[PDB]
């Protein structure tokens, strides 16, 4: 089942699976921590369970 993220490039071209493994590749200041904070902001607050 899909995981809506609120990010246009993610939900369109490579949508995340609710219960699946997601990887964010990139190196040295491309933004894979800003992207992971946005998934914390968007996905986790509307998730219901616990985060680690």
């Amino acid at each position: 089942e899909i995981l809506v993220t609120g990010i246009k490039v993610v939900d369109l071209l490579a949508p995340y699976q609710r219960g699946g493994k997601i990887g964010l590749f990139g190196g040295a200041g491309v933004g894979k921590t800003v992207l992971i904070m946005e998934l914390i902001n968007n996905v986790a607050k509307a998730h219901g369970g616990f985060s680690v």
């Binding site: 899909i2 490039v9 071209l13 699946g20 997601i22 990887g23 491309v30 933004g31 992207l35 902001n41």
Partner: protein
Amino acid sequence: ATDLGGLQERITTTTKGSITSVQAVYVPADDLTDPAPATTFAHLDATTVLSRSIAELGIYPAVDPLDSTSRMLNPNVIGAEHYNVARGVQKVLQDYKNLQDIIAILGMDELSEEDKLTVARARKIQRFLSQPFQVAEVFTGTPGKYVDLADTISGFQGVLTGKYDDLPEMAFYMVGDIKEVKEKADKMAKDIASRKEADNKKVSEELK
């Protein structure tokens, strides 16, 4: 491969519970063929490859749309028209990628009209894949945008058919959805139309 694999195989959804894992994977010296990124690719259901060449264009999130894959991009899983908009966007971006060298040395003025239609459409969907994040408001100032899934399918369905060939490219840059490219174009057109005589200062002669 077994150190990584013995770790990654514990992060799964079982029948008793679920783990939705998001893990950042650093690439050393921006190399994806390095063995520590290349081994991690197999263990993931969805991959989101962020590029430096895309980020230096100012497109944020710097997602390579021709390197980011998911097993959910399947017409039996996400639906028929979501899948066709997604594959349609990737075909415009791949065709523009094939034109990059001849545009670089010959210029825009030498392509076909069929080619320079897709150059202008792929330059539009390149900017429209960018988005202001709510966590980037502290250093950018632009407010973030949670775009709904229906808003990005029909927003990207309009660009592929040609409903917005007349809009400028920069109206697509850093907006939420397809309503906001129409508001940003109206704002963009107005700012080169709004002009005032003697600027209404009233700054001198301010009493007490």
